[PDB]
Write a protein that binds this ligand. Structure first.
Ligand SMILES: Cc1cccc(/C=N/c2ccccc2/N=C/c2cccc(C)c2O)c1O
Ligand SMILES: [Cr+3]
Length: 152
């Protein structure tokens, strides 16, 4: 997978907006993920019993994880593909098990929330670029998974 500098700028331009409210975007993304694919919530022993969106919105553990996710992903995206240093530790956290299928689910949630919150600028071009960036992310982290003996 390869993105042009222009495509990377579309990704970083929308991410700058995410950075204006990391906690909020994080809550929206995780809630979308958990409601769409409930099995993913089972991976979090600290808040796997949350059910209503109200409870999810009031959860500090969920909010903190959302911030962790967006902060880490933001660092990865800013590397514009040269993210080996960032994927190594993340693979450690995900493969010692978060399957590729779950990464696809959260990628879908990210695209959905970005479009919902920034429809004026997050169009087909930006969505396509973000999709490529997340696809690259999943492909490369899968490689890291395999180095640890996990197929994902
Ligand atoms: C996508 C992404 C970007 C940056 C950071 C993370 C961190 N993930 C985790 C870190 C520590 C422990 C668990 C993590 N991920 C848990 C997880 C659970 C269900 C579904 C998905 C999909 C997950 O990534 C992350 O998942
Ligand atoms: Cr994770």
């Amino acid at each position: 997978m390869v993105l042009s500098e222009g495509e990377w700028q579309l990704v970083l331009h929308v991410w700058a907006k995410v950075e204006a409210d990391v906690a909020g975007h994080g809550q929206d993304i995780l809630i979308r993920l958990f409601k769409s694919h409930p099995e993913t919530l089972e991976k979090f022993d600290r808040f796997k019993h949350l059910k209503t969106e109200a409870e999810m919105k009031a959860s500090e553990d969920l909010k903190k994880h959302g911030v962790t996710v967006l902060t880490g992903l933001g660092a990865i995206l800013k590397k514009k593909g040269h993210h080996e240093a960032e994927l190594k530790p993340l693979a450690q956290s995900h493969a010692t098990k978060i399957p590729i299928k779950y990464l696809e689910f959260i990628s879908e949630a990210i695209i959905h929330v970005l479009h919902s919150r920034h429809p004026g600028d997050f169009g087909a071009d930006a969505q396509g670029a973000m999709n490529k960036a997340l696809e690259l992310f999943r492909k490369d982290i899968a490689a890291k998974y395999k180095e640890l003996g996990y197929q994902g």
